[PDB]
């Protein structure tokens, strides 16, 4: 690594931040019966 | 006389900032001096050897008049000192976190913690970046706010100061019980440090090293396009260049040098780390920087004489008010002791020498009790009284004993 | 795949900031053209930063040709009345 630009004290430093877009909802592992296969293909009994 | 004080006291304003709490700074000035600490490199390891100078070598804890408070604590002896030190195990560590704490930060500052069952858990020292006291017109603390991150931002809440205590080691004035951070007294030397260190790393990149010039085509002759450049770039590039490669050409190529230009980048440090060391009061010797003509004779007893006074005067501070404001009310209010007894926690001198102190007892142990000689010698006093409180050896009472 | 100069990239690099920081404390007006070259225009986006020559100091410093009292280098956003 070669940084172009230094850090100074007393966080007179640029603003050093990334604002999040928006993020979904996620539930299917707790809202279904999950199943870890061995295998890619295969098949539940009936 | 009075009971009350009748002179008055530069006081809140909250340094004209708005919705007045703290004196003079704020959350972001407190967060300010956190990164000045966790950032790293020389100025922060520099205030941490200032931290171990002054508090680094431990503590011992005494009471005037220990063996007259000899009493069953739990069908148990104990003095005042002994039920402390089993109160305190860890107090080395505590004075030593407290203790930078105070020089980093305006003040150390705690809570006081019991057990479920109620009896005494601990001190308990708090983040001082996270709090800031608010104080009376008499200039004593009434309250302390608190901000701190969680996940969901920003927490924010106020506490009494009736079960906090905190120190201060840098006081503005006697009468100052908010105090002031050193390193945002010293914000401007140490940006100046930091500056001129990005200087001269930027400058030794740049100048410290040779580089190749070639330059192509004759002088008034013929001009060399962008494309044609990159043809020669190819020949000479220091990618691909080794030691002893070697170039043939025409007489209208020619291997200039960028030689690497003389500045004292040595000078420069040594006087940046002066300025360091004596704005933040250490020695130069610290900052791995030593001086010409200083190194000897009286010029050294001068500065390191100036040293441990600057660490005697910052250890009695430290060591008052963590007796009247830690240990006393928890003798007070968990201990079946008298907490108006004459406790004292003495921390220790870092630059002690215990073969100068060898000496000494050669010297003039003839005038000390054999209790003076283990106390200057760091040991236990002797089990027997008699001895203990006697002028002569103990091994020199062993063998007259011997001769009876 | 992205690269430093790619347009969803420049939010990212430092440079692009310090550069714009830069641009705003060198500039007199919003004229871009005069002032910087295409090359920093276009790799910087000058267009889109908020260059009018308010944020440089020249702006508010004295320069006058005579100076019998010092008031050379006064700033006036500096005053008890700013
Ligand atoms: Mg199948
Ligand atoms: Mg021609």
Redesign the interface.
């Given at each position: 690594s070669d940084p172009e630009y230094v850090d100074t004290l007393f966080r007179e430093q640029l603003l050093e931040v990334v604002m999040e877009g928006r993020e979904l909802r996620k539930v299917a592992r707790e809202a279904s019966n999950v199943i870890n296969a061995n295998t890619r293909v295969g098949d539940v009994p009936i | 006389a009075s009971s009350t004080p009748q002179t008055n006291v530069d006081s809140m304003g909250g340094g004209h900032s708005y919705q007045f709490n703290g004196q003079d700074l704020t959350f972001?000035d407190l967060?300010?001096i956190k990164?000045?600490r966790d950032?790293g490199g020389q100025?922060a390891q520099l205030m941490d050897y200032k931290a171990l100078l002054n508090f680094g070598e431990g503590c011992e804890i005494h009471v005037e008049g220990d063996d007259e408070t000899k009493q069953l604590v739990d069908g148990e002896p104990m003095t005042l000192s002994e039920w402390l030190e089993d109160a305190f195990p860890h107090l080395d560590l505590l004075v030593l976190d407290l203790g930078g704490d105070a020089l980093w930060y305006p003040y150390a500052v705690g809570e006081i913690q019991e057990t479920i069952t109620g009896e005494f858990k601990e001190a308990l020292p708090a983040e001082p970046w996270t709090l800031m006291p608010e104080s009376d017109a008499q200039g004593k603390v009434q309250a302390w706010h608190q901000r701190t991150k969680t996940h969901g931002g920003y927490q924010t809440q106020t506490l009494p100061a009736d079960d906090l205590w905190h120190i201060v080691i840098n006081k503005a004035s006697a009468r100052d019980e908010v105090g002031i951070s050193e390193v945002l007294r010293n914000?401007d030397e140490?940006?100046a440090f930091?500056?001129n260190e990005?200087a001269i790393n930027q400058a030794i990149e740049l100048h410290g090293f040779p580089q190749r010039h070639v330059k192509v085509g004759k002088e008034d002759g013929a001009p060399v396009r962008d494309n044609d450049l990159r043809r020669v770039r190819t020949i000479f590039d220091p990618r691909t260049t080794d030691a002893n490669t070697a170039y043939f050409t025409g007489q209208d190529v020619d291997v200039e040098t960028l030689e690497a230009h003389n500045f004292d980048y040595s000078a420069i440090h040594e006087m940046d780390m002066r300025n360091l060391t004596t704005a933040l009061g250490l020695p130069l010797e610290a900052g791995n920087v030593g001086a010409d003509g200083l190194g000897s004779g009286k010029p050294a007893e001068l500065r390191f004489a100036l040293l441990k006074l600057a660490i005697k005067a910052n250890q009695r501070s430290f060591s008052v008010q963590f007796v009247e404001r830690v240990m006393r009310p928890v003798v007070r209010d968990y201990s079946p002791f008298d907490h108006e007894a004459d406790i004292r926690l003495e921390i220790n001198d870092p630059l002690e020498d215990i073969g100068e102190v060898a000496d000494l007892i050669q010297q003039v142990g003839d005038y000390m009790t054999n209790e003076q000689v283990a106390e200057k010698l760091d040991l236990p006093a002797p089990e027997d009284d008699e001895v203990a409180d006697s002028y002569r050896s103990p091994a020199d009472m062993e063998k007259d004993e011997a001769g009876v | 795949m992205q690269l430093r100069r790619s347009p969803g990239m420049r939010p990212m690099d430092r440079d692009w900031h310090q550069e714009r920081a830069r641009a705003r404390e060198q500039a007199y007006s919003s004229d871009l053209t005069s002032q910087f070259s295409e090359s920093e225009i276009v790799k910087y986006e000058l267009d889109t930063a908020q260059i009018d020559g308010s944020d440089n100091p020249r702006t508010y410093i004295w320069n006058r040709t005579i100076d019998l009292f010092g008031m050379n280098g006064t700033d006036v956003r500096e005053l008890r009345n700013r």
């Amino acid at each position: 690594s070669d940084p172009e630009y230094v850090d100074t004290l007393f966080r007179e430093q640029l603003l050093e931040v990334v604002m999040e877009g928006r993020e979904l909802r996620k539930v299917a592992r707790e809202a279904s019966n999950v199943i870890n296969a061995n295998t890619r293909v295969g098949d539940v009994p009936i | 006389a009075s009971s009350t004080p009748q002179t008055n006291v530069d006081s809140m304003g909250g340094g004209h900032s708005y919705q007045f709490n703290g004196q003079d700074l704020t959350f972001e000035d407190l967060r300010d001096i956190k990164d000045v600490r966790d950032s790293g490199g020389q100025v922060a390891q520099l205030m941490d050897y200032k931290a171990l100078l002054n508090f680094g070598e431990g503590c011992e804890i005494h009471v005037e008049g220990d063996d007259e408070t000899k009493q069953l604590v739990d069908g148990e002896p104990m003095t005042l000192s002994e039920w402390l030190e089993d109160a305190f195990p860890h107090l080395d560590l505590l004075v030593l976190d407290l203790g930078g704490d105070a020089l980093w930060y305006p003040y150390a500052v705690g809570e006081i913690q019991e057990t479920i069952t109620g009896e005494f858990k601990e001190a308990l020292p708090a983040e001082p970046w996270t709090l800031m006291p608010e104080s009376d017109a008499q200039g004593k603390v009434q309250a302390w706010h608190q901000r701190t991150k969680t996940h969901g931002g920003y927490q924010t809440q106020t506490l009494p100061a009736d079960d906090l205590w905190h120190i201060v080691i840098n006081k503005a004035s006697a009468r100052d019980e908010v105090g002031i951070s050193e390193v945002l007294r010293n914000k401007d030397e140490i940006q100046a440090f930091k500056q001129n260190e990005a200087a001269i790393n930027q400058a030794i990149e740049l100048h410290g090293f040779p580089q190749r010039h070639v330059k192509v085509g004759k002088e008034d002759g013929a001009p060399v396009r962008d494309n044609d450049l990159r043809r020669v770039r190819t020949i000479f590039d220091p990618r691909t260049t080794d030691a002893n490669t070697a170039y043939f050409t025409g007489q209208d190529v020619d291997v200039e040098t960028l030689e690497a230009h003389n500045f004292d980048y040595s000078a420069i440090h040594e006087m940046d780390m002066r300025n360091l060391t004596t704005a933040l009061g250490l020695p130069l010797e610290a900052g791995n920087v030593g001086a010409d003509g200083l190194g000897s004779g009286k010029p050294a007893e001068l500065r390191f004489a100036l040293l441990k006074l600057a660490i005697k005067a910052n250890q009695r501070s430290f060591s008052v008010q963590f007796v009247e404001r830690v240990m006393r009310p928890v003798v007070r209010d968990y201990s079946p002791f008298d907490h108006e007894a004459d406790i004292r926690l003495e921390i220790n001198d870092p630059l002690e020498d215990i073969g100068e102190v060898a000496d000494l007892i050669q010297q003039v142990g003839d005038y000390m009790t054999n209790e003076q000689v283990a106390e200057k010698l760091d040991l236990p006093a002797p089990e027997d009284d008699e001895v203990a409180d006697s002028y002569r050896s103990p091994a020199d009472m062993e063998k007259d004993e011997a001769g009876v | 795949m992205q690269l430093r100069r790619s347009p969803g990239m420049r939010p990212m690099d430092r440079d692009w900031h310090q550069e714009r920081a830069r641009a705003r404390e060198q500039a007199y007006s919003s004229d871009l053209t005069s002032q910087f070259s295409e090359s920093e225009i276009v790799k910087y986006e000058l267009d889109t930063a908020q260059i009018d020559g308010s944020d440089n100091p020249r702006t508010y410093i004295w320069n006058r040709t005579i100076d019998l009292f010092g008031m050379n280098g006064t700033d006036v956003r500096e005053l008890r009345n700013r």
